[PDB]
Design a protein around this ligand. Structure first.
Ligand SMILES: Cc1ncc(C[n+]2csc(CCOP(=O)(O)OP(=O)(O)O)c2C)c(N)n1
Ligand SMILES: Cc1ncc(C[n+]2csc(CCOP(=O)(O)OP(=O)(O)O)c2C)c(N)n1
Ligand SMILES: Cc1ncc(C[n+]2csc(CCOP(=O)(O)OP(=O)(O)O)c2C)c(N)n1
Ligand SMILES: O=C(O)[C@H](O)c1ccccc1
Ligand SMILES: O=C(O)[C@H](O)c1ccccc1
Ligand SMILES: O=C(O)[C@H](O)c1ccccc1
Ligand SMILES: [Mg+2]
Ligand SMILES: [Mg+2]
Ligand SMILES: [Mg+2]
Ligand SMILES: [Mg+2]
Ligand SMILES: [Mg+2]
Lengths: 524, 524, 524
């Protein structure tokens, strides 16, 4: 058997059937004779390739396979990997290396010191010492990406390895099943449960890993039993709780002071599947107000280590959420009252306010719609005006790296063909991975792209204010015709300069059979 | 003064007055109060930012300053840096870090293990241990990028450093002048000169570093004195010799066997400013045929070390070229006869043959035009059909990383306002850094983009044929409207489906006052 | 031929004939059938192996070859490499890797992520992608270590590579000659020479690289022509000037303020072959007093970049020293007056004062003796009381890493069999690489070890006093019998509790035919 054959067998046996990539000569020996049980998804640029795969992996809750071209290709995807790292996305990144016979002279396309290139943005980076080792190395890649805490991995393979003979003993790799579905031991778990049962005024903070583990339901239960309010950890990469459940209290602002203020009065704060805490703006203060004790359940040792306060338990979020939900007692306290609906902002017949757009989307989008957010200055209003009842309904660049939403929305839509994906992207953000649109058109992936156009890097103008910065260059991005760009890549385009047009566009997009981009004129 | 003030003073004192970047919050403290003697060039995506700066640096022959946003921003430019590394481009890459007070918890936007991120694609990567150290660190960055062998450097700075007080002793950094303009010692230089004077049938091979050092003229002289043929080293990132000079013998094919064959019969082969040798395709054979001795003059120790044959001298290409040109004796041998003009290929009234395009470009483009090449399957014909008489007239992604030409052409044009830049880019390559177009429009940089559209990854289909590799997915890129894309970013667009239209388009583009993109229908 | 045969051929052809190492199974395939024209020097511990090789390389002024055992072996030598890096020691460090067939499972002895292990203490670190590449990789190692700035390199080789067939084209590696013997271009050199000729009160500061390039003589000339005082850069790893020459002004204290004070009044300060400046203690002040201009000639770009002041020229120290010495005019100024002999300290009939020891050594040691210093609290008196007239007469751990002197002295003695090597080592320092003594005994290398025994980490106690730091543990090292330790490794031992015994011991050691260790009772 060839390394080629054995590797594809390993891949299918491990459940992989899709390859996201952008071809190069170093990868031809791998891509040739592409198995009929596999499908290839092409993207015009590596940032888009990984972005799409990322969305696919996050939504499908299974690892995604990627194939890039040597250093340059890997390099173009580094930004995307920074996000994947923060979202614990199980991505298997493979890149073609020059033929071993020419790595020495460093012939064009030689990935020099390869394994070090994607570092420190991957859980594991490696290049086999021989062709027969490739299948084994691939096995390691697959599991390193899948084990908690999930994350991106990198494997570099010289192109002349594929045709070489594979080690017969490689078949032992095919059905290996590795599990990390673990939870705190019984004795210690009871101690925790008792603490929760004793809490006089508990509070729960949920992170992206909850949604990744599809522990949403269990968390809803846990929250109802403890009759506690639920917040989403700051800089939320995903939505781990139904935003209209009586317990939900929204997205926590990414500030130290802001959060300790919010948690004040709560004797026990239980954080699940989130870093403690992904702060953003500099909002100095107390990590926790006196009287508040924090307990963190994370799937990542690195998260537990850097938490500046509280205790931590490193385990599987799904296993823990389930266990806790079924052990805590039903508190006799009154279930929290649902937060009131947000106020309806004034809206004339001109350019739209973000609030108006979200309110409209909320009214017209299907209940199981999936949103992606890369409209950097409107995140707060968005989290308040969109009723997301189900899991996997929200995605935001986990590392703040723009250029994620657009390609990722295509991946998500590819993973969830039965759920309408709607990506709300700022006019500035839309440019980073604009070429991703082509993939949606080509494979007819019905993603809807709502471009919020205010002609400026809104969020930055905001920070400029708080940072009290003046004469800052490059904050405006005028002169971009998104309908023209959509046309450039074969995607139906619509324009919405006012509320009536927005409604009309949305209605048309919703019923359209292919991808659709709507350029919305928003207020600065 | 502040770290902010002192740094800008250091920058201007070191000749820097332009900042290429894409803003983020971590960089606001640095960009605020932007000095009036500086200019900011905004690009919609980091790959474009570095690409533009790269072209600017290569053409201006002076370092270029870049400002990116934390990890994600740096990550998006990794592909671009792979090229910069191969072309010895003096790029000073600076990226904003989170405020020191929040690096510990790893707040959103914290560049974790920062210095390791751009490795191994930079000569130096660093993050200061204190705010007062920033100016010094900046000084190191500037010089590390400028000293031979020039290359990209990385400096990460926590955003709260800028407002801090600078060390008064920093003024000692302002006017530091570091030189690496060195050449082989007298005794040894004479030994070399005598060897060249004794060569019965010498041959000269020139690399990108010759053009970078503007040693072109001196090399022409050297070639005429020795009455020797001149070749351009394989995978040429730049053109180091007038392509129509009687001695010129063209671009060497990137094959081991092909090159040793070419050099057979030449007793002494002098290679200047090039790696020995940037092979590409696997063309096994002898590094050198018996009877051929090789001598390499490189500015990079890494190049001299990995050369699989011949002797080497590590020194400044400019200094050496000059010295050699003035010391070698005038050989009595007959000056080589100029190569004959390439044949005119058959061309009907339909889609154009690449040859036709280049022949036309050669006839219509100004004599001091500057070309950029990212039409991967037509490089050979291009090098044969374009008469490039002057230095800095050709640029090709040094590492083979696509997405360079388009943004780089804008940088070159910005550096050479008096020379018409014409970038010939394949329809596939054009997508990688498509958003760069916006910058050309915004700053009205009159670059001309000629998109060779054959709807496929030509170079890849070719190779597929050698590998007789069949069933290779993702080799075609149909459905892209480049005129629409150009419109999307505000750039005048034209279409050329045949020779007459090509001529008309070129003529219009040439006289146009702003950037122009021409979509040319080429044969598959 | 085999990789084994071809590599040894490359080694001998490149002038290497000695292998310093400590064997392991991964290295057996390389060491078997050890060529008769090579010699192996065994050391009991890796820190000693590299230490010995380091001394050998520095004295012989040629690269030294080392062979260590996988990660653990490389690991034990990391401290030694830190010194080698600071002294620009051309060391070729090779370590045996597990067989390629077992690197995947990480069998015992697998050097994981090998190339990263010695980083950042090596100029180049690498592991070949195939057996046939080994000879080429070795070639790169040899040259990367030898080119300016010289330094240690690392090459990891799977043990199953040696028996594999070597690429026939490898013979092209055998006689490659790479040169970096370069100097500033003519035009710019004259500008420099004129500046020196115009200096009204020039000063010269010499570094270790001067002695490494054996540019001592030329510097003496240069100093006499300019009639300028000469200082040795702080933390001197070597002695670059005859310490009793009328111009010599001694070792500069490693303090910023101290040095700018020393240089005050000198309009032009020329620094050659030294970092600007290897400060040690925190002595804040001005880098240079107003009126002083500094010019640095360094062989290391990293040195030129971090210099906080002055101009710099990166070139070969030998070439530059020679050129300058023969171009500067003979100043009409009065040649500096030789510094007076140091005062003779009071010495009773008890424990000895360091001063007494040095005075005695100076009187009894041959004029071409070679000293090594690792008596951390007596460096100043030593530099004042030892008349070192010739080059390669002094060595001090370049990075301050103790455990260098003892093994290095053996290497130096092995390189200079005709010069008596005398290593003055503190009782604390002697322990770090104590086992090195065995090698001296085994190969009968007549090194003389003078242990300064005051039963305490003297230098640290000093610093403690500045910090007025009190209650610092682990500063005393009582209970060590060095004569017993010497006996343990088969080295003749002597004791000196007073001046008469010292004289007697030295006299006996000097005439002894093998290594000799003298334990000297010094005052605390
Ligand atoms: C790759 C990358 N480059 C730069 C940034 C910094 N940045 C953060 S928000 C922002 C503005 C983008 O705004 P847009 O999406 O147009 O909408 P708005 O800010 O008005 O919400 C920028 C440039 C980033 N996060 N990622
Ligand atoms: C960033 C990056 N991704 C992928 C590749 C691999 N690659 C090399 S040539 C090529 C084809 C691009 O072709 P195009 O420019 O459309 O024209 P051609 O000359 O090939 O017909 C590709 C995809 C690369 N070099 N760089
Ligand atoms: C490997 C290593 N460990 C620790 C130190 C720190 N250190 C510096 S000087 C010193 C004292 C050694 O003293 P000794 O050689 O006995 O003599 P004296 O200090 O009295 O001169 C120590 C422990 C070091 N430089 N290197
Ligand atoms: O795929 C390849 O071979 C490689 O990326 C390449 C091919 C042709 C031109 C530039 C770069
Ligand atoms: O610039 C920033 O602050 C940062 O990149 C950011 C801001 C807002 C949303 C996402 C990311
Ligand atoms: O040389 C080896 O094989 C290896 O270092 C080894 C061998 C036996 C015991 C421990 C370690
Ligand atoms: Mg990296
Ligand atoms: Mg905007
Ligand atoms: Mg094409
Ligand atoms: Mg290390
Ligand atoms: Mg002591």
């Amino acid at each position: 058997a060839s390394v080629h054959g054995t590797t594809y067998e390993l891949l299918r046996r491990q459940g992989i059937d899709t390859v996201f990539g952008n071809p190069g000569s170093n990868e031809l020996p791998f891509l040739k004779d592409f198995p009929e049980d596999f499908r290839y998804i092409l993207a015009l640029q590596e940032a888009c390739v990984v972005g799409i795969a990322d969305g696919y992996a996050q939504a499908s809750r299974k690892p995604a396979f990627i194939n890039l071209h040597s250093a340059a290709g890997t390099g173009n995807a580094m930004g995307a990997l920074s996000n994947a790292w923060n979202s614990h996305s199980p991505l298997i990144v493979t890149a073609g290396q020059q033929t071993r016979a020419m790595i020495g002279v460093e012939a064009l396309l030689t990935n020099v010191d390869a394994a070090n290139l994607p570092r420190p943005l991957v859980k594991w980076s490696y290049e086999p010492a021989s062709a027969a080792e490739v299948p084994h190395a691939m096995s390691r890649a697959i599991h390193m990406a899948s084990m908690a805490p999930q994350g991106p991995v990198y494997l570099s393979v010289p192109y002349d390895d594929w045709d070489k003979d594979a080690d017969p003993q490689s078949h032992h790799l095919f059905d290996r099943h590795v599990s990390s579905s673990v939870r705190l031991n019984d004795q210690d778990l009871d101690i925790l449960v008792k603490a929760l049962n004793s809490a006089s005024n508990p509070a729960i903070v949920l992170g992206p890993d909850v949604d990744a583990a599809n522990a949403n339901a269990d968390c809803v239960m846990l929250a109802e039993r403890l009759k506690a309010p639920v917040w989403v950890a700051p800089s939320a990469p995903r939505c781990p709780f139904p935003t209209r459940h009586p317990c939900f209290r929204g997205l926590m602002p990414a500030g130290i002071a802001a959060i300790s203020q919010l948690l004040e009065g709560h004797d026990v704060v239980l954080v699940i599947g989130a870093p403690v805490f992904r702060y953003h703006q500099y909002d100095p203060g107390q990590y926790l107000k006196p009287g508040t004790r924090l307990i963190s359940v994370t799937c990542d040792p690195l998260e537990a280590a850097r938490a500046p306060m509280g205790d931590a338990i490193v385990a599987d979020i799904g296993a823990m959420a389930s266990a806790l939900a079924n052990l805590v007692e039903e508190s006799s306290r009154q279930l929290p009252t649902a937060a009131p609906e947000p106020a309806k902002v004034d809206q004339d017949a001109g350019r739209l306010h973000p609030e108006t757009v979200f309110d409209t989307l909320n009214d017209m989008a299907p209940e199981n719609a999936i949103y992606l957010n890369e409209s950097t200055s409107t995140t707060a209003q968005m989290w308040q005006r969109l009723n997301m009842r189900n899991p996997g309904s929200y995605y935001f660049c986990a590392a703040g790296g723009l250029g994620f939403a657009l390609p990722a929305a295509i991946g998500v839509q590819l993973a969830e063909p039965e759920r309408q994906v709607i990506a709300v992207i700022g006019d500035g953000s839309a440019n980073y991975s604009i070429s991703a649109l082509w993939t949606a058109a080509q494979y007819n992936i019905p993603t809807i792209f709502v471009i919020m156009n205010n002609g400026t890097y809104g969020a930055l103008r905001w920070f400029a204010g708080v940072l009290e910065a003046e004469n800052v260059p490059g904050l405006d991005v005028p002169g971009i015709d998104f309908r023209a760009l959509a046309k450039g890549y074969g995607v139906q385009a619509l324009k919405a300069d006012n509320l009536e047009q927005l409604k009309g566009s949305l209605q048309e997009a919703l019923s359209a059979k292919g991808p659709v981009l709507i350029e919305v004129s928003t207020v600065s």
